[PDB]
């Protein structure tokens, strides 16, 4: 029965090696990828808060100016 033992062992080792390495490299590429989205989100957050401040101050000063005119 050692023939089936050897055949199944060879099949098992090959499949485990290939699947393990593939899953490894896969997750690896995801790891490398995530940081780009992280920094993009940081930059957009900076930009949006800048927009908010600028527009708020502009409108409040403009309401003040309109009140002064009237």
């Amino acid at each position: 029965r050692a023939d089936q033992l050897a055949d199944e062992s060879l099949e098992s080792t090959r499949r485990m090696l290939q699947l393990v390495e593939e899953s490894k490299d896969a997750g690896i590429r995801t790891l490398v990828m995530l940081d780009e989205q992280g920094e993009q989100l940081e930059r957009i957050e900076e930009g949006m808060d800048q927009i908010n401040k600028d527009m708020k101050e502009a409108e409040k000063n403009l309401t003040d100016l309109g009140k002064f005119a009237g």
């Binding site: 199944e8 098992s12 499949r15 485990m16 699947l19 393990v20 593939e22 899953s23 896969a26 997750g27 995801t30 990828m33 995530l34 780009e36 989205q37 993009q40 989100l41 930059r43 957009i44 930009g47 949006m48 800048q50 927009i51 600028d54 527009m55 502009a58 403009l62 100016l65």
Partner: protein, 63 residues
């Protein structure tokens, strides 16, 4: 018993591989959305700043 447990391992590893195949496309699509939203927000901020500044100077200096 070894055969049964190795078949269980076969199952589990196959599902794990399929699950990564699933995560990959979703993550890539999220990134694709992120780039476009970033571009649009940068355009919006630039336009808002320049328009408001120029209009304010033009409507403040004529007096």
């Amino acid at each position: 018993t070894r055969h049964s447990e190795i078949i269980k391992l076969e199952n589990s590893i196959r599902e794990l591989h399929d699950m990564f195949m699933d995560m990959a496309m979703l993550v890539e699509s999220q990134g694709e959305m992120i780039d476009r939203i970033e571009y649009n927000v940068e355009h919006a901020v630039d336009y808002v700043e320049r328009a408001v500044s120029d209009t304010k100077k033009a409507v403040k200096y004529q007096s």
